[PDB]
Amino acid sequence: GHHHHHHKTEEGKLVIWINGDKGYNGLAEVGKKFEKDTGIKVTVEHPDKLEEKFPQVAATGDGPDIIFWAHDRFGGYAQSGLLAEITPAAAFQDKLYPFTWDAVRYNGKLIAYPIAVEALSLIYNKDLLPNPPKTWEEIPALDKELKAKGKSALMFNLQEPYFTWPLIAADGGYAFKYAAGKYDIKDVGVDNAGAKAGLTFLVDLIKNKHMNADTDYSIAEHAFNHGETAMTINGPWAWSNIDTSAVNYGVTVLPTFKGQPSKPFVGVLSAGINAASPNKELAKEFLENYLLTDEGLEAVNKDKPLGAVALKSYEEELVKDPRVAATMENAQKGEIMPNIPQMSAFWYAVRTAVINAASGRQTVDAALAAAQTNAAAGTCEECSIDEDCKSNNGRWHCQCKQDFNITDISLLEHRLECGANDMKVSLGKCQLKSLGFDKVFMYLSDSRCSGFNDRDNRDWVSVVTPARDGPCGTVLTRNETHATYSNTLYLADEIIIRDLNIKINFACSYPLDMKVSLKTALQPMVSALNIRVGGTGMFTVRMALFQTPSYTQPYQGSSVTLSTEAFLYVGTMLDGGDLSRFALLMTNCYATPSSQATDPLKYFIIQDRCPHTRDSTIQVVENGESSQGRFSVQMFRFAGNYDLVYLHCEVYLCDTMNEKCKPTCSGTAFASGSVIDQSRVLNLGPITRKGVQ
Amino acid sequence: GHHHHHHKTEEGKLVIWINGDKGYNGLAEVGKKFEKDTGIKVTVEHPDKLEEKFPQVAATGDGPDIIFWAHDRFGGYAQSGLLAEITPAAAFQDKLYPFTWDAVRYNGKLIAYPIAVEALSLIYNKDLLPNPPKTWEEIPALDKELKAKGKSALMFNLQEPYFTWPLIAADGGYAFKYAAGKYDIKDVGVDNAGAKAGLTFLVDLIKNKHMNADTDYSIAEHAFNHGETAMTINGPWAWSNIDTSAVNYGVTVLPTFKGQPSKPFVGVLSAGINAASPNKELAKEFLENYLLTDEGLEAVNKDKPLGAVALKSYEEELVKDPRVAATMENAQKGEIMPNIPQMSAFWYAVRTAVINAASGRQTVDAALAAAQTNAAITDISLLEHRLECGANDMKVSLGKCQLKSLGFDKVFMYLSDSRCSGFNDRDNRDWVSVVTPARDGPCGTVLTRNETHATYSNTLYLADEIIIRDLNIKINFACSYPLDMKVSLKTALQPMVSALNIRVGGTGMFTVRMALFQTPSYTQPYQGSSVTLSTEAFLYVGTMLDGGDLSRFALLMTNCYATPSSQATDPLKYFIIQDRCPHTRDSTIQVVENGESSQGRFSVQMFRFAGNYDLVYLHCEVYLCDTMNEKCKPTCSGTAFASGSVIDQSRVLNLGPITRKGV
Numbered sequence A: 001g002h003h004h005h006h007h008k009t010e011e012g013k014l015v016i017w018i019n020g021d022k023g024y025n026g027l028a029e030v031g032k033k034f035e036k037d038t039g040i041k042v043t044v045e046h047p048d049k050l051e052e053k054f055p056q057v058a059a060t061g062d063g064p065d066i067i068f069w070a071h072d073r074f075g076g077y078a079q080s081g082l083l084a085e086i087t088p089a090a091a092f093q094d095k096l097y098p099f100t101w102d103a104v105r106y107n108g109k110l111i112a113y114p115i116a117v118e119a120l121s122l123i124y125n126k127d128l129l130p131n132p133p134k135t136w137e138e139i140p141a142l143d144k145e146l147k148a149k150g151k152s153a154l155m156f157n158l159q160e161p162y163f164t165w166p167l168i169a170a171d172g173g174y175a176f177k178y179a180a181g182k183y184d185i186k187d188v189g190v191d192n193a194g195a196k197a198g199l200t201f202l203v204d205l206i207k208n209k210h211m212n213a214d215t216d217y218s219i220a221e222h223a224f225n226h227g228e229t230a231m232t233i234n235g236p237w238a239w240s241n242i243d244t245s246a247v248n249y250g251v252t253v254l255p256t257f258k259g260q261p262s263k264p265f266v267g268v269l270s271a272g273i274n275a276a277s278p279n280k281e282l283a284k285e286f287l288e289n290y291l292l293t294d295e296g297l298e299a300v301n302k303d304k305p306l307g308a309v310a311l312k313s314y315e316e317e318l319v320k321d322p323r324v325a326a327t328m329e330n331a332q333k334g335e336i337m338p339n340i341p342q343m344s345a346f347w348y349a350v351r352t353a354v355i356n357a358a359s360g361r362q363t364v365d366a367a368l369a370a371a372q373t374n375a376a377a378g379t380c381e382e383c384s385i386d387e388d389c390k391s392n393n394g395r396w397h398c399q400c401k402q403d404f405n406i407t408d409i410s411l412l413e414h415r416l417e418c419g420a421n422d423m424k425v426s427l428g429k430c431q432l433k434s435l436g437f438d439k440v441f442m443y444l445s446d447s448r449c450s451g452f453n454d455r456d457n458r459d460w461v462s463v464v465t466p467a468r469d470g471p472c473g474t475v476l477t478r479n480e481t482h483a484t485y486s487n488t489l490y491l492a493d494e495i496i497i498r499d500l501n502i503k504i505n506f507a508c509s510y511p512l513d514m515k516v517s518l519k520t521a522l523q524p525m526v527s528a529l530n531i532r533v534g535g536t537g538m539f540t541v542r543m544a545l546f547q548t549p550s551y552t553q554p555y556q557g558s559s560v561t562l563s564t565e566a567f568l569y570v571g572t573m574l575d576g577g578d579l580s581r582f583a584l585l586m587t588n589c590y591a592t593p594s595s596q597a598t599d600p601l602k603y604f605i606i607q608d609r610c611p612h613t614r615d616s617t618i619q620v621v622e623n624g625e626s627s628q629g630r631f632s633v634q635m636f637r638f639a640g641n642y643d644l645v646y647l648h649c650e651v652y653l654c655d656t657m658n659e660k661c662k663p664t665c666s667g668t669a670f671a672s673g674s675v676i677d678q679s680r681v682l683n684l685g686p687i688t689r690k691g692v693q
Numbered sequence B: 001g002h003h004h005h006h007h008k009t010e011e012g013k014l015v016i017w018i019n020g021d022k023g024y025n026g027l028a029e030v031g032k033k034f035e036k037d038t039g040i041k042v043t044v045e046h047p048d049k050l051e052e053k054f055p056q057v058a059a060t061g062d063g064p065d066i067i068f069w070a071h072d073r074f075g076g077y078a079q080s081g082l083l084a085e086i087t088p089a090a091a092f093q094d095k096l097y098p099f100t101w102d103a104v105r106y107n108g109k110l111i112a113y114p115i116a117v118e119a120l121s122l123i124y125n126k127d128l129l130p131n132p133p134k135t136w137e138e139i140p141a142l143d144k145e146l147k148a149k150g151k152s153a154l155m156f157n158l159q160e161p162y163f164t165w166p167l168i169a170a171d172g173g174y175a176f177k178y179a180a181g182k183y184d185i186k187d188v189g190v191d192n193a194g195a196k197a198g199l200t201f202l203v204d205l206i207k208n209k210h211m212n213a214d215t216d217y218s219i220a221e222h223a224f225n226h227g228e229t230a231m232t233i234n235g236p237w238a239w240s241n242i243d244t245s246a247v248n249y250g251v252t253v254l255p256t257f258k259g260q261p262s263k264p265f266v267g268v269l270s271a272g273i274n275a276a277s278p279n280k281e282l283a284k285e286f287l288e289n290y291l292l293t294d295e296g297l298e299a300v301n302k303d304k305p306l307g308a309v310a311l312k313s314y315e316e317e318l319v320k321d322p323r324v325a326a327t328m329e330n331a332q333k334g335e336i337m338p339n340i341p342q343m344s345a346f347w348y349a350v351r352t353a354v355i356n357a358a359s360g361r362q363t364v365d366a367a368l369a370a371a372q373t374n375a376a377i378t379d380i381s382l383l384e385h386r387l388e389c390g391a392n393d394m395k396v397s398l399g400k401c402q403l404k405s406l407g408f409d410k411v412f413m414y415l416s417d418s419r420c421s422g423f424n425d426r427d428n429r430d431w432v433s434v435v436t437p438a439r440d441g442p443c444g445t446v447l448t449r450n451e452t453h454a455t456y457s458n459t460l461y462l463a464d465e466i467i468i469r470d471l472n473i474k475i476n477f478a479c480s481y482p483l484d485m486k487v488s489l490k491t492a493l494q495p496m497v498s499a500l501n502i503r504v505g506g507t508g509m510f511t512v513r514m515a516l517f518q519t520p521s522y523t524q525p526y527q528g529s530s531v532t533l534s535t536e537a538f539l540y541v542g543t544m545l546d547g548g549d550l551s552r553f554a555l556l557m558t559n560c561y562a563t564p565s566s567q568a569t570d571p572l573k574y575f576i577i578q579d580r581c582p583h584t585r586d587s588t589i590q591v592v593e594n595g596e597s598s599q600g601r602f603s604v605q606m607f608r609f610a611g612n613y614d615l616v617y618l619h620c621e622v623y624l625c626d627t628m629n630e631k632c633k634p635t636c637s638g639t640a641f642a643s644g645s646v647i648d649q650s651r652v653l654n655l656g657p658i659t660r661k662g663v
């Protein structure tokens, strides 16, 4: 007997959200194992701002069955009843460390499964520095030293407060005072001396050009991984990218500040179950039986490291690695995050205060003051990066930052969205509003198509144009495969009455569908072949001839006529079933002097999936790659004896799962493939010479 | 015998240059037979760097009458007009394979005679191992195993790029892109990922002491023939030395790299005629009558193997040997060398990249970059950005010249994942492009859904230096697609849906689903076990078949109706679709899709329809309609239908309750 019996005839499913920076593939593999055993499928998807999006959808009774995050968010969900209560047997609970269970406990109830323990650690290049700086104060020396070598000392994400927090709290800065076994929200440690010291040091570092304020995760990763930075600050999940990198690296404790250790907020990677989920039992089985296991966490950790796991058995072995040991050493120096809801607001309040102090929009005192005032305020979560959250006597509100520093380049930063029938270009609203823009922010080649405040995203100001030639001065450009719709975005120096000239040429390229070209034609010349697949499958292959190199504007009527130098553009299309499963392959294409496809005289354009020769007389654009295929032939230059010829194409449906369809053509011919299945042949003709202007 | 008439009182001589690794003796023997018949002397010499030496002497109106080499060089000579045009009869051309003639063709003219087809093959001791390693990745293991015996696994010449090329080209590597029937010289495939993979693997091989970077032809041949190496990689011309050796050997296909086959550059051994020679006629007779023949090639091939010959007659018999067959198999995997002149410059650029990466003088990136380069201010500030949204992929492209105009000395761009890096993109314009799948989570791509649409977005970082300066730019790009009904239904956590299992042919299992949707796009399905509607609200219903390929069938909804009770058999029915057609001609009912596809879709204003009752249940009878007769999609002329309707309850899907807003 098998496990599969209990879940048989399941209409149930399992949907998982996790941040893409952790290993999704290992989790997916565990999903494949779960699918193997139980016969139930498991999906893993990464939405933008998933921790923020989850509550929104979850409120409506929709979302993933499982959500992965650091515990600090979870209690915020629990307060809203978005998380189903976990109630595992003691035997199971005993397998994980109690503090990891404490992290996920909220208001007495377990709202999630602890997975792993996350703490920021100091990552450095072993080749570049043998001994890393043990303190923060000695880094500027290193940077000044390394600046001569054409490199930098330290680069790490400055955009997320998670990364800058440890230095701030190093001297005793804190989020929410823990008192009488409970967190006090009206007691906030943001504006004290230690925070100011840490942040002042950070600002003083970036002011000295030791680090750029524009630096983010991606940039720092890229910089460090190319060995152009001596060290960075990060968690286990990064390591996977460094291993593959030629960089020889090491992980140790963060540097001290004022003789005090860096105090990182320690996260617990945790898996919550949606309260709306019908699948809760399956989720519990999956998480308990499969996800948390030596093998499972081995897999996930193998894709990307988890750091210190909550599972005792695997951890006891996993600690043997020095890096996670360093991660623990760091964690023990810092403090585990509160799971309370306010943490959502806190993080937002710091981020605003760090970037303002870094950009120089405010002093550390002013920034931290605003921060402390906004620490528990939930409204401030609604504010974008470029917005200040301002506190009135009555209530908090969002406001655009009053001052931006804009290079002639900064204006070129933009969002380009290519939709199916339309194109949209978007630019930051505040950066524009800063310059005195009330309205009519921007326009395209046609000045009548103007900017509007984006109805979806308050942050953006957007311009839209259909993707077709002639509205809003949009322009179409075709090549054999694709149709590219392009336009230019002008910025208006008028309303602001100040001149800095920039324009952005943007374009959306879409694949060309010849079936549309055929449907557009009143009476196109086309041959069709129905192909039955198995009991229930049915497919259709069509072959048609086109007047243009774009493979558009097909010939109409019962005959085609060519100039001596003319190119015939042939194309083939597949319909029915999954166009993904099968790829359209043209196995043998040839011409005959007669109408019979069985003609003893065959002139092969394509033979054995490959061109008959390398001459320009035959050009094959698309074969075996997709649902369509395309090739051109100069017909009467290729076969010249005859005043007309007929065209024949043998076609085969290529399963892309079990065989690779795209042919490899060496330019050496066997001529052993002369066997043709006439049931698979499409025929078109006659193809005649003009003989008249 | 009677040939003697056309040659009497003979004069002049014939001088031939050919590489010494091929049979010099056989060619000379044929030359001596030619001398016997014609009474004209023929000299055969093998100079050092003969291919480089030929143009030098040829420029002065001095040199050999005939030159033997791979075709890739010849177009370089032809461009210099050092080669006389050959004009053999069709009857003769039919005797050799056309592609061999295509190789020797340049700018429309045939500049030389094809002799043989050469491709690198994997030579191994058949006695030593029954089956050779099928991949490159497993070689270090074999070597480590063989390291205990005081020997090595694989040794071959690393000095000539010709021998190392296949691994480089195994994964997506290429010299010159073949487009519109001609080779593109400004389109170069040297700096791509696969080449880097292969060459990096090679460096990693020599770094592990599995093979010495100093290894050359002599060393590998001498070593393998003496049994100090288990296997090597080489062409036919080497075999002659292995045959005499007591070693029992075999020849097979090169090992795969990254799941893809090795693509050796396939050479065509070819004989060109000097343009300065008055003796061209004699050269032509020599090449046509004697050199290319069963008897002629027999001598040369018997002396040393030519591999697969261009001559049909001799090849047809010669294929029966497994070695040349393996050589053919290898040839079929790779691609023939372009005949263009630039190849002369190419080989020089790669050779530098092979030795520099091996010795450790440069990184693979630097070497391949330099090679690729060798192969081929600001007033207003503007940028060129092109986004291509494919079905399975996205490509983002930025124009080079604009980046230069914007003051970028060098271009580094990448996505959220720094592992995804830009490459040089050749189109109607020269671009720098990055590619990513259109699904979320590779390359740090992220999904954003709204009720109607699934939007896949990512950020493109663009900067001059890896260490970031004051100038760095980032560009957010996104591809938004409409949501599929099935997908919308499958994505939903707890959608309201009714399902019916169907068997077809008694084989396999399929199902039919009916579900309710909040949007006119038929997306954003209702959640829960019940739906509640305003009096004026529109219920968007859809029905789809799932669980495998039903493509031969179109989903047809014959009768769809509402009942005040939960019973589908209720005598009181309000018909939305009756006799396959919409009950009313009004905006109150719209049937979007019926009998057309695997899906069906319709909207109804439910409570103007149901009237007096504050709740209803929805019922849809469904059938698989065979589309072969093309009668499936129903035609509705008028709103008048028979009240009597025959319904099979086994095919009816039921959903409810559907309740009115405000009690």
Ligand SMILES: OC[C@H]1O[C@H](O[C@H]2[C@H](O)[C@@H](O)[C@@H](O)O[C@@H]2CO)[C@H](O)[C@@H](O)[C@@H]1O
Pocket: A019, A021, A051, A070, A071, A072, A073, A118, A160, A161, A162, A163, A267, A344, A347
């Ligand atoms: O910086 C604010 C952010 O910090 C934490 O998120 C971390 C997370 O702990 C790590 O697992 C890793 O993924 O990096 C994240 C930040 O980039 C908090 O969990 C989160 O609520 C908070 O917004």
Ligand SMILES: OC[C@H]1O[C@H](O[C@H]2[C@H](O)[C@@H](O)[C@@H](O)O[C@@H]2CO)[C@H](O)[C@@H](O)[C@@H]1O
Pocket: B021, B051, B069, B070, B071, B072, B073, B118, B160, B161, B162, B163, B235, B237, B267, B347
């Ligand atoms: O390595 C560069 C070199 O490769 C080719 O020459 C080959 C030749 O094609 C083979 O037949 C073999 O036997 O000898 C050479 C080994 O490299 C190119 O034809 C030549 O121009 C180039 O220098």
Ligand SMILES: *[C@@H]1O[C@H](CO)[C@@H](O)[C@H](O)[C@H]1NC(C)=O
Pocket: A213, A359, A360, A361, A404, A405, A406
């Ligand atoms: C110029 O912009 C940068 C980055 O924002 C920063 O130095 C600051 O915002 C501006 N300069 C000053 C002196 O404030």
Ligand SMILES: *[C@@H]1O[C@H](CO)[C@@H](O)[C@H](O)[C@H]1NC(C)=O
Pocket: A479, A480, A481, A482, A483, A484, A509, A621, B388, B427
């Ligand atoms: C056609 O142009 C598009 C961009 O406009 C490009 O992505 C595609 O590769 C081009 N087709 C070919 C065959 O090069």
Ligand SMILES: *[C@@H]1O[C@H](CO)[C@@H](O)[C@H](O)[C@H]1NC(C)=O
Pocket: A417, A419, A456, B450, B451, B452, B453, B455, B480
């Ligand atoms: C959903 O988002 C897409 C992505 O741009 C947009 O095109 C569409 O208009 C949006 N639909 C609604 C109903 O907001």
Ligand SMILES: [Zn+2]
Pocket: A003, A006, A007, A038, A285
């Ligand atoms: Zn089970």
Ligand SMILES: [Zn+2]
Pocket: B003, B006, B007, B285
């Ligand atoms: Zn003669």
